[PDB]
Amino acid sequence: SIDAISQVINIAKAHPNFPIALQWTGGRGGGHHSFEDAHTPMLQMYSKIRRHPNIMLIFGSGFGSADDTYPYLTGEWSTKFDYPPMPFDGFLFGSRVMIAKEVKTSPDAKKCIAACTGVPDDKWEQTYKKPTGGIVTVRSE
Amino acid sequence: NILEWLENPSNTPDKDYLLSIPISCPLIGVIQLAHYVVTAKLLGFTPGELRSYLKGATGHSQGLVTAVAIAETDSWESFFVSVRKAITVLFFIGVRCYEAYPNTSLPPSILEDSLENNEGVPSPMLSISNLTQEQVQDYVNKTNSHLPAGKQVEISLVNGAKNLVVSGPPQSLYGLNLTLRKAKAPSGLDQSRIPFSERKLKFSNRFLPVASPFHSHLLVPASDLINKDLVKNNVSFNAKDIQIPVYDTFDGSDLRVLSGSISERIVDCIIRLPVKWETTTQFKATHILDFGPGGASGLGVLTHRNKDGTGVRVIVAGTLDINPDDDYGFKQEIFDVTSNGLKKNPNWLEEYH
Amino acid sequence: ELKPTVILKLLKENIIQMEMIENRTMDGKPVSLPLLYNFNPDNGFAPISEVMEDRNQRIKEMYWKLWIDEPFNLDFDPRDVIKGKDFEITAKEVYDFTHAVGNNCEDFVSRPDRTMLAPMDFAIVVGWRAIIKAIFPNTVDGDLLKLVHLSNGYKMIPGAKPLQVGDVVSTTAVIESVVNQPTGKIVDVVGTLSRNGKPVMEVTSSFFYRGNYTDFENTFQKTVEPVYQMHIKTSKDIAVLRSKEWFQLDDEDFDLLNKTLTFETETEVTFKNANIFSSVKCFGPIKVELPTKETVEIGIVDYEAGASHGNPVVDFLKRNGSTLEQKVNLENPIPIAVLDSYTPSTNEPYARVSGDLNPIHVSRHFASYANLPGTITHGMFSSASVRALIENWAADSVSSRVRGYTCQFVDMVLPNTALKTSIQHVGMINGRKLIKFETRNEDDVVVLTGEAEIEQPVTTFVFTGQGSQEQGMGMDLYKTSKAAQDVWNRADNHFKDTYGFSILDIVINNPVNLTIHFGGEKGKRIRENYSAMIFETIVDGKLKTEKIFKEINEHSTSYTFRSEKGLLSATQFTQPALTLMEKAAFEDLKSKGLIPADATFAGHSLGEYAALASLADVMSIESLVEVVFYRGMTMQVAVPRDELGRSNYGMIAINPGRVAASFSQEALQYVVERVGKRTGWLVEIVNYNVENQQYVAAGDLRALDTVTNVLNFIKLQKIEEVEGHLFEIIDEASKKSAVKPRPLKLERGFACIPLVGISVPFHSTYLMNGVKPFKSFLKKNIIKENVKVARLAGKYIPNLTAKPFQVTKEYFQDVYDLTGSEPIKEIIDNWEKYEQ
Amino acid sequence: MKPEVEQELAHILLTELLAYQFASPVRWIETQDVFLKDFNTERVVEIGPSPTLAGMAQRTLKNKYESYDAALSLHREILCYSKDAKEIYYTPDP
Numbered sequence A: 001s002i003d004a005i006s007q008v009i010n011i012a013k014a015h016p017n018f019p020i021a022l023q024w025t026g027g028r029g030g031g032h033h034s035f036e037d038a039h040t041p042m043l044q045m046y047s048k049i050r051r052h053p054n055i056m057l058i059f060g061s062g063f064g065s066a067d068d069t070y071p072y073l074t075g076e077w078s079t080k081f082d083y084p085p086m087p088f089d090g091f092l093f094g095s096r097v098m099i100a101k102e103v104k105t106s107p108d109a110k111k112c113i114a115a116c117t118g119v120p121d122d123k124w125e126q127t128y129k130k131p132t133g134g135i136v137t138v139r140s141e
Numbered sequence B: 001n002i003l004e005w006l007e008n009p010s011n012t013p014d015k016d017y018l019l020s021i022p023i024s025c026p027l028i029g030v031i032q033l034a035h036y037v038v039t040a041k042l043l044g045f046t047p048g049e050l051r052s053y054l055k056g057a058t059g060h061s062q063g064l065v066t067a068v069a070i071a072e073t074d075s076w077e078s079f080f081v082s083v084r085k086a087i088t089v090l091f092f093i094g095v096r097c098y099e100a101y102p103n104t105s106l107p108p109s110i111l112e113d114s115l116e117n118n119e120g121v122p123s124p125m126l127s128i129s130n131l132t133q134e135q136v137q138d139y140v141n142k143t144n145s146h147l148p149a150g151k152q153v154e155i156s157l158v159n160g161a162k163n164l165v166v167s168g169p170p171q172s173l174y175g176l177n178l179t180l181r182k183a184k185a186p187s188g189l190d191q192s193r194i195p196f197s198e199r200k201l202k203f204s205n206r207f208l209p210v211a212s213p214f215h216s217h218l219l220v221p222a223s224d225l226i227n228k229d230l231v232k233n234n235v236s237f238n239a240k241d242i243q244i245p246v247y248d249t250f251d252g253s254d255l256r257v258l259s260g261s262i263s264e265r266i267v268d269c270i271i272r273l274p275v276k277w278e279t280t281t282q283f284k285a286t287h288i289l290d291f292g293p294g295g296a297s298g299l300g301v302l303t304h305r306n307k308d309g310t311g312v313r314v315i316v317a318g319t320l321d322i323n324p325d326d327d328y329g330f331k332q333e334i335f336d337v338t339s340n341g342l343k344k345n346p347n348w349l350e351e352y353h
Numbered sequence C: 001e002l003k004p005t006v007i008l009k010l011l012k013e014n015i016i017q018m019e020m021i022e023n024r025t026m027d028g029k030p031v032s033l034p035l036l037y038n039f040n041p042d043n044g045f046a047p048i049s050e051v052m053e054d055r056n057q058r059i060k061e062m063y064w065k066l067w068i069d070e071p072f073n074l075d076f077d078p079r080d081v082i083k084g085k086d087f088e089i090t091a092k093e094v095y096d097f098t099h100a101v102g103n104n105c106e107d108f109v110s111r112p113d114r115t116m117l118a119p120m121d122f123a124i125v126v127g128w129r130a131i132i133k134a135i136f137p138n139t140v141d142g143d144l145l146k147l148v149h150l151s152n153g154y155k156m157i158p159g160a161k162p163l164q165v166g167d168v169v170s171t172t173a174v175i176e177s178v179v180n181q182p183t184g185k186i187v188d189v190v191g192t193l194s195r196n197g198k199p200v201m202e203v204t205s206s207f208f209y210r211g212n213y214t215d216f217e218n219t220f221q222k223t224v225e226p227v228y229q230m231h232i233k234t235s236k237d238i239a240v241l242r243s244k245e246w247f248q249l250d251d252e253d254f255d256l257l258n259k260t261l262t263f264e265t266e267t268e269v270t271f272k273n274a275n276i277f278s279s280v281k282c283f284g285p286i287k288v289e290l291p292t293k294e295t296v297e298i299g300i301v302d303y304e305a306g307a308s309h310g311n312p313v314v315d316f317l318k319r320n321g322s323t324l325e326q327k328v329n330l331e332n333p334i335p336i337a338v339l340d341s342y343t344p345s346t347n348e349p350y351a352r353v354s355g356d357l358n359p360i361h362v363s364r365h366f367a368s369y370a371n372l373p374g375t376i377t378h379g380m381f382s383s384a385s386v387r388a389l390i391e392n393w394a395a396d397s398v399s400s401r402v403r404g405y406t407c408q409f410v411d412m413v414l415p416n417t418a419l420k421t422s423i424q425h426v427g428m429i430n431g432r433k434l435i436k437f438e439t440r441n442e443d444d445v446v447v448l449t450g451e452a453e454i455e456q457p458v459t460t461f462v463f464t465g466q467g468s469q470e471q472g473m474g475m476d477l478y479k480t481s482k483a484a485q486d487v488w489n490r491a492d493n494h495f496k497d498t499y500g501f502s503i504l505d506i507v508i509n510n511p512v513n514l515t516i517h518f519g520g521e522k523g524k525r526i527r528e529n530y531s532a533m534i535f536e537t538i539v540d541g542k543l544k545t546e547k548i549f550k551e552i553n554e555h556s557t558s559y560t561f562r563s564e565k566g567l568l569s570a571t572q573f574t575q576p577a578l579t580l581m582e583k584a585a586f587e588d589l590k591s592k593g594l595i596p597a598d599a600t601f602a603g604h605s606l607g608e609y610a611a612l613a614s615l616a617d618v619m620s621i622e623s624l625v626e627v628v629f630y631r632g633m634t635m636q637v638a639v640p641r642d643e644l645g646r647s648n649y650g651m652i653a654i655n656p657g658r659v660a661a662s663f664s665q666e667a668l669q670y671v672v673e674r675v676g677k678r679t680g681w682l683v684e685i686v687n688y689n690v691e692n693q694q695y696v697a698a699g700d701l702r703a704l705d706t707v708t709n710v711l712n713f714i715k716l717q718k719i720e721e722v723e724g725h726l727f728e729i730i731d732e733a734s735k736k737s738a739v740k741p742r743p744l745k746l747e748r749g750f751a752c753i754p755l756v757g758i759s760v761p762f763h764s765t766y767l768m769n770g771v772k773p774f775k776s777f778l779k780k781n782i783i784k785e786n787v788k789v790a791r792l793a794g795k796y797i798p799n800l801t802a803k804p805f806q807v808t809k810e811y812f813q814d815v816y817d818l819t820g821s822e823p824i825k826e827i828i829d830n831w832e833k834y835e836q
Numbered sequence D: 001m002k003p004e005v006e007q008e009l010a011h012i013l014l015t016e017l018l019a020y021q022f023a024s025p026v027r028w029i030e031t032q033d034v035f036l037k038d039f040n041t042e043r044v045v046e047i048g049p050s051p052t053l054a055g056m057a058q059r060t061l062k063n064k065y066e067s068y069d070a071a072l073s074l075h076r077e078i079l080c081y082s083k084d085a086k087e088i089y090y091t092p093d094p
């Protein structure tokens, strides 16, 4: 969230020489996730993040191809949002590689993962109430 | 008596009288012209030379008069002519606007409610931040529908995507503030555990230090009086005499190419039409020089926030201070000769290309 | 600029003339006050002597030239009324006055699409020429340079709108009272401002010619004595009153015993000297308090006497009766705010705007000659600034909300001084907040003090009908308030006399059973009272009679009221108790002065009757209790009941919001009508309480069960074709509910709440046959003379027609649009005859 | 119109309204709309043992007259005699 991004910025300020990789992931990301949107917190905190050159912005939480990450690489994803271009320094693909050949996931689990059709970003919030795209939210211990 | 007030601060008028528009308009113009004079003299440029070096000029509502006056300036001799025209225009618009819609004392019940609910003194202009134009316009539409035709409110300054100002009667703006408070979540609310879609939208509204409802229907009848009296005062701006582009506050078009009277357009901009600052800020420039009042709270920092990340530096000439973030300049950066003076704000598209 | 101010020369060889010129005038031409002094060289110690002859005349001539714009003529009767010139209120004049006084109220500032009001302080501007002309005549002789404005005040006449821009106001001044006190001559003037013929307000002004005066032949005093009240308890009081010559009655045989007389007297006294009046007259109406708390004139007080030391009428009334004070102080004052006002350096703008060109306020030399500390600011300016502050703070910057404002100028005020005014709310007068103000200068010295009457915000009085029937209802007010005691005692006495029970006892104790016994002559009278009352009904155009209290007859020795839990829960006793507690509460409020004159009122069910008896006083306590009690008893016989007393009818409270979020009142009415028509039984909405969230339906309790089941169906599911689909549900519910016994119990649904203790469908079409006889009973109880159109119109919102009560053809036509009545058609058809 | 004829007509109208009150439904929605919107009532005073009509007025205002009261700055003070006697009597707690 914003407080976490502020803490990361404070750590980068305390150690300007040491490289810090801010791996931003919205609530739409797989596994454990927060309630924050993937886009708006970046729109708020990008200027502060880039105020420190030693922070690398890595964008995950809902990426599985080059087509949907290229706008984030070039930064033109923000042009539709009435913002200037916002290039990102990298990406992380968590759920996209869950059905890779070398992952220890079982064949039936891989078939189930592939069977999950997914859901666009604007409808990711509809997982705390009912399943959408084959994925639903649950609560941990 | 500006000279007496300056010489003897003890017997200066009270802040409300000073903030009243018949004082505030000409005095703010004089302040902007003083900043321009200080800059030009300390740098050794004549006003005409400094203006020629400027790629463009503009202003937020009132500052358009000063911008066009600076564009008018040619030399130190005619600089007083330009100053006279600017002060005359500002004085007349202030006087006529005050006569059209003079301020009145509001109920102490309303004042007490506003102060008790962590709100400023009601004023004819209310700035709303962190709310989009569609939402602010919807609230204004509800308030107008439930108010009579004479007391309607409308958006005056479109400062940004999430920064607007509504102008109108202080009573109407207080009612709009009540509606916004009803629709506003507590500032000290923790919403981290609620989904983003289901989160209540939080925003900040505050009454600006203004004494009349600028860019409102209430000041419409003063427009004709101003137009008929500026010709009597012999104050007019000519496109040919203007030699740098000046961006109209409403649509951002250059005032030189306007078929109609530039003075009339400026008056209509200040009193009737809204200020679409984003639309006017479409000019391509690397550095912006803010001569307005407020310094860090002035127009320069707001423009910097609007244009952040586009590689456009903003330097405020109204005060001498240091910015720890260093994301906008100050008066020293204008006169610095070393590389510290030349600061280019980061361009995310190019820097992180 | 520099202009001549004083010219000293020799008018005569033995006279020194000091012309004191006042360059500030109406037409700009200077006016000089020639002060003549005799010069006697023989008396070397004091050669210069003031010429007292014609001195007051010359001062008055100069002041006349400054103030009044008519030919100088001091020879006119002070008793005769002064008529000032017509004055036109203009936007420029109001603008100048507001910005000279310091009035920032929005009501007086020009605004688009809204008329501009004028300040109440503008009355002195309008009528200065008439008010100040009162102190001029030669009969009221005195030194105008030594005049002191003791006090001023404004009084808005009720029903008069505040002054507006463009209206023409006529001013008419009259000397209320000129008297010679040892310290000087006090002259009290009253100037009426009238608009379009009607009178708008009255402005009182008290002036003081400081000096020594003995012309008592020209002194007179009018004074409105306080309203006096006498309760005639015995024939001794009647004999004492009849022994008084001044006490006269139109009806000499009027029965004064057990009556309250109100005396509103005006005293005119002409003075022979400082102590003994040359003539004393005391005249006014004497009125009696009717059962409806209405004072109606029955006589006149007319005392006339020559030389006397006092007025015996006032002394007698003070000694015997009690003083009725309209102003009622609160238990403690409520401080509003402490405010600071800075007097301007120059009094020229206020002088020009108000027309008060008194030289003492603008000229140093005139003030020095008058021995003042300086060019003292206008006392009227101070009063107007303070009134602006009160209307801003006490009245929340509402011009119309200020109706009275009296100010007293205890001490002078100099220019450029800080005035600290403390506003307090001390009492109420006729529903108007009484606000005191006390201004103090920088030296903590009081320079101004007075009262103001600020109308309360727009008030409505809504009288409950379905309140709780808890024990001890209104008893705290019965213990404390005297008016509540009077109301409750009158009701209890009437109930004891008529039906032989105590409503106070029923409220206090709530007995389960109450036995009324018919022994003795009083018991026989109570028994006949019980037998007389009958519920009449119209069936087939026939007046059938149903005798309430079946078990009462000539041979009956007692009757017992039967209740399950308590008698206070019974409709027969809970409704009189509710009406009485509400009436007592309102009477306590009225005694405290908390009832605005223009306040509106409404009432739910018999709350309407309570509201009529409270605000309009259409009927007395004795008639109100009779009507309410009869209505309560009629519910015992209005529906058939089994041997155990349980009736087949009832009421439920529906909540469409609980059934669904899009359940409209139209949808609920559709369901109700279709249920009723399909099932054939009686069911309909009786109370529309809250939009789409609270309604009440009445009818056969069995039918209410079907309605509850239908709404349960609609809630649980997502629910000509629509009519048939609803009719299917209606048949299902109808044949599901009818199997139960007739005196069933209505189960509470997800949105339906049965009303406990209700067993008759009132506010329904069922009780339509009984309207005409009940209307006759109401006509018997409510007297035409006691109905007050002023007190009903614009304030009463009937439940039948939920609009302001108005005596108009549109209103009468609207009555038929809901319920047809032949008298309404008679009135509508002959409306032209009634209009003439 | 003559005052006595006006009084007669008003009395007849009042008796008719009172007579048909129990034979007709009570239109308290219209009554509330009248005394809240048409008159802009700033203070409502409820005379009764319990705050029935007071709560009804509060709930009507919450449902319908919320933005209206906000826009026109109407401080609608709903007072019941049973609980808000201090506010009605102007006896604030010191």
Ligand SMILES: Cc1cc2nc3c(=O)[nH]c(=O)nc-3n(C[C@H](O)[C@H](O)[C@H](O)COP(=O)(O)O)c2cc1C
Binding pocket: A025, A028, A029, A030, A031, A032, A060, A061, A062, A063, A092, A093, A094, A095, A096, A098
């Ligand atoms: C199976 C799975 C396990 C994960 N485990 C962790 C974890 O142990 N710790 C963690 O910080 N994030 C974990 N994540 C989240 C991802 O590492 C990453 O932060 C991002 O949120 C994935 O977004 P995406 O699924 O849309 O690509 C996990 C994600 C998945 C799908």
